[PDB]
């Protein structure tokens, strides 16, 4: 390598992603958040079980120190079929969840989102499935990652203590 060129991109929140409109929005607005970042589809046998888990989690820890930020993608088994706008709608009407869902993205191959690509190049895992997840700590690197069949059970400990530092950090630092 050379020194110079090492670890050029060190934060998931330095990326531009399209929103579920397919306006540009900077993550960098989730800077100083703990972020559980999701794969989700609205067309799998997965998709009721997360959502519903994902906005106990988001209601329980957000909005301030926490966001759930989900990427739909029509990558595992065709899971996500509707355009990116229904994705949200869907997701607001079946499950009134208030966290952020952006604009269907690729995960695998050539075109795969850099934003989601800098996740797995983090962590070695690519997702297999729908519904992979993806911690991020207030400094916008990745340091977990569970499986889809991982319960909610294993993933709010890991949550819980990542923002209990925030609160204490945001209380008594500058």
């Not at 579920?20 to 972020?35: D, F, I, N, Q």
């Not at 739909?72 to 949200?88: A, I, L, T």
């Not at 989102?113 to 911690?135: G, H, I, M, Q, T």
Request: charged share 30%; proline share 6%; glycine share 6%.
């Amino acid at each position: 390598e050379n020194l110079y060129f090492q670890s050029m991109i060190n934060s998931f929140y330095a990326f531009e992603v399209k929103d579920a409109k397919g306006r540009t929005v900077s993550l960098e607005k989730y800077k100083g958040k703990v972020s559980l970042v999701v794969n989700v589809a609205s067309d799998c046998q997965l998709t009721d079980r997360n959502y519903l888990g994902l906005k106990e989690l988001h209601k329980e820890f957000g909005p301030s120190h926490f966001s759930v930020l989900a990427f739909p993608c029509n990558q595992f088994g065709e899971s996500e079929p509707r355009p990116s706008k229904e994705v949200e709608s869907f997701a607001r009407k079946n499950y009134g969840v208030t966290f952020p869902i952006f604009h269907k993205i690729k995960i695998l191959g050539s075109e795969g989102e850099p934003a989601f690509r800098f996740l797995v190049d983090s962590s070695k895992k690519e997702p297999r499935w729908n519904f992979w997840k993806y911690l991020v700590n207030p400094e916008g690197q990745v340091v977990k990652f569970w499986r889809p069949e991982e319960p909610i059970e294993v993933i709010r400990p890991d949550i819980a203590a990542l923002v209990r530092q925030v609160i204490i950090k945001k209380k008594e630092d500058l």
